[PDB]
Design a protein around this nucleic acid. Structure first.
Lengths: 193, 192
DNA sequence: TAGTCTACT
């Protein structure tokens, strides 16, 4: 290996990733049993397109000809088979575009987020991708205003924790409340207050 | 072929591509580096790999018997793949280098002990905190998790995402780190 | 927590 992603992650089945990689390399179809969705236990045949890594891992793939790309949980897939069948990917397809535009459900209300990053971290703010669609505005005093529209306030508050005292939550109020809730939960657990 | 979710720095594929070409060709790499003791200065290194996380980093050594260091990609400029060999150490493992820390930062390696509440025990069994992880179920349904790594500040950031379901058992420096990071954020955000 | 530099959180 010459590139490594540092840090914690879900355990991954290497044989599953291996079959996915082999199918993509071969421009071949991939089949698997899927314990989930509409029809659990059914064998699915897909054009594999790539993998999304995160707190959970997903295969990105089209089912059927003309099918739209979907995400499938790796840890719900079994019985992977690399098929003797061609499956060339669409020329148009962008995995990152997929990850932004057609991936990720919010189960909380979407908010207009406004963050002010203190000038001591303005460097990091100006190179940071909070969201595929964000606006970053340097301000007179050296601070940086970051705005984007998104749900996921709890996960966002977890990320904001890594900026320490250098981020001010300007809006929305629910994000301020979330950040206090998560801080109070951990602060009580660990004896901070 | 792979995309990682969540906030991240923007990526320069031109820089990443130069680095990968130097590594593949066993070639030296040169760049001006805006960090460490002599900012701006041109550095000639033996490139070893790329470490993804925090801001991106090149892992590379400099000088005779130099140990691998981490170099932030955004502090690198004037990247040149030199037409000149730069053999890597024969027994270098980039994964082993990454495994010295829970995250990026390479400081004293600690023996970490966590207790995960029963309500998240099954999640903990599915979660790879570290390559050295060992899990031990307790009779009351909690799980003890051990691993050996540096990087207690980044660990404390990760433990925040477990909320009240994680107890820090050891080391003391990790308890102190978690408390300080919480106090700093708590004061900033008016949590108490 | 909090630093040293051929480096980093």
């Amino acid at each position: 290996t010459i590139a490594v992603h540092a840090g914690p992650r879900p355990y991954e089945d290497q044989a599953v990733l291996g079959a996915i990689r082999a199918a993509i390399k071969g421009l071949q179809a991939l089949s698997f049993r899927y314990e989930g969705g509409s029809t659990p236990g059914r064998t699915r045949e897909v054009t594999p397109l790539g993998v999304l890594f995160g707190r959970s891992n997903y295969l990105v793939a089209l089912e059927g000809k003309g099918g739209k790309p979907r995400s499938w949980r790796l840890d719900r897939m079994s019985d992977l088979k690399v098929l003797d069948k061609p499956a060339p990917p669409p020329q148009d397809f962008s995995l990152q575009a997929f990850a932004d535009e057609s991936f990720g459900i919010y189960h909380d209300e979407i908010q207009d987020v406004v963050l002010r990053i203190h000038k001591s971290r303005a460097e990091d703010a100006l190179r940071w991708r909070f969201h595929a669609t964000q606006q970053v505005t340097p301000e007179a005093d050296g601070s940086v205003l970051v705005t984007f529209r998104a749900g996921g306030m709890r996960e966002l508050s977890w990320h904001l924790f890594t900026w320490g005292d250098a981020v001010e939550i300007v809006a929305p109020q629910v994000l301020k409340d979330m950040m206090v809730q998560e801080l109070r939960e951990a602060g009580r657990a660990h004896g901070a207050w």
